[PDB]
A paper describes a structure:
[name] is one of the most abundant and polymorphic glycosylphosphatidylinositol (GPI)-anchored proteins on the surface of the [name] merozoite, the invasive blood-stage form of the malaria parasite. All variants of [name] share conserved N- and C-terminal regions but fall into two allelic families, 3D7 and FC27, distinguished by tandem repeats and dimorphic flanking sequences within the central region of the protein1416. Here, we use the mouse monoclonal antibody (mAb) 6D8, which recognizes a conserved N-terminal epitope on recombinant MSP224 but does not recognize the parasite surface, to gain insights into epitope masking and strain specificity of the antibody response to [name]. The mAb 6D8 was first demonstrated to bind the conserved N-terminus of MSP224, with the epitope localized to residues 11 to 23 (MSP211-23).
The affinity of MSP215–22 for mAb 6D8 was found to be 87 nM, which is more than ten-fold weaker than for MSP211–23 (6 nM), suggesting that residues beyond the mapped 8-residue region also contribute to antibody recognition. Although a single C-terminal amino acid extension had no effect on binding, a single N-terminal extension was sufficient to restore binding to control levels (6 nM). The α-helical propensities of MSP211–23 and the equipotent minimal epitope, MSP214–22, were investigated by circular dichroism . The minimal peptide epitope was substantially less helical than the 13-residue peptide (MSP211–23) in aqueous solution and over a range of TFE concentrations. However, 6D8 binds these peptides with identical affinity, suggesting that recognition by 6D8 does not depend critically on the extent of helical conformation in the unbound epitope. The structure of MSP214–22 bound to 6D8 Fv is therefore incompatible with the structure adopted by [name] on a lipid surface, which offers a clear explanation for the failure of 6D8 to recognize lipid-bound [name]. This mechanism of binding was also observed in our 1.7 Å resolution crystal structure of MSP211–23 bound to 6D8 Fv, with the three-residue N-terminal extension in this peptide making no additional contacts with the antibody. The conformation of the [name] epitope is identical in all four structures, with backbone RMSD over residues 15–22 of 0.13 Å (heavy atom RMSD 0.54 Å).
Numbering used by the authors:
A (entry chain Q): 12 to 23
B (entry chain A): 1 to 114
C (entry chain B): 1 to 111
Amino acid sequence: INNAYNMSIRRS
Amino acid sequence: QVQLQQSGDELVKPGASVKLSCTVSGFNIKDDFIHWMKQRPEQGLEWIGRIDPANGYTKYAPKFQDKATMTADTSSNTAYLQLSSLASEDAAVYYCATYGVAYWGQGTLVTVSA
Amino acid sequence: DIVLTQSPASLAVSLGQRATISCKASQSVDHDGDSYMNWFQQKPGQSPKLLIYAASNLESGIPARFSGSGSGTDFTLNIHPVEEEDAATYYCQQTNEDPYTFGGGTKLEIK
């Protein structure tokens, strides 16, 4: 399930 | 569940500094960046930078490196944006955002005149 | 910086028809199989509202009339059928590399 916390920014 | 409540509109004098706030409810700000965006009147959006409230680490867009200072208080779940040496091009609506960039504050208008 | 160029800057569409907005990036906004392109809607006096993230994912609360596609450097927002409440300015945004950048906006009007 897609989620904007995970995927609306690139995290490293 | 998440709301960002920004501080009230401010008219500031050239040369002065101002500090805006962004109080977050429904979300522990230790758990994500808070981002700040600028929108000049009738213009487009610019990203100013982000702060990681857990450790205070910040990353600014280069054009705001000397203009903006971001801080955060994890106990009050509040983030602050300080703008220095105000000039007319600093007049804008400033937004905070978090949960990636999914949830935004209602904006704070800064106008600059004297 | 990654420069985002949105097309068209002004778009007039009839109710019921399909609106398409394009965002071209000067460099890739992909990393390891994910595209970091967002689309926002903004009405006057209101905060930008996230529509689509990671190029094609529909944000909670947004109807499926909105859809996103593309990868790499070329991305597209489609709205259909267009309804009165879609009149707004739309922005693309990339969040792959710093500084994050926005396109210059597309104003959607009803014809």
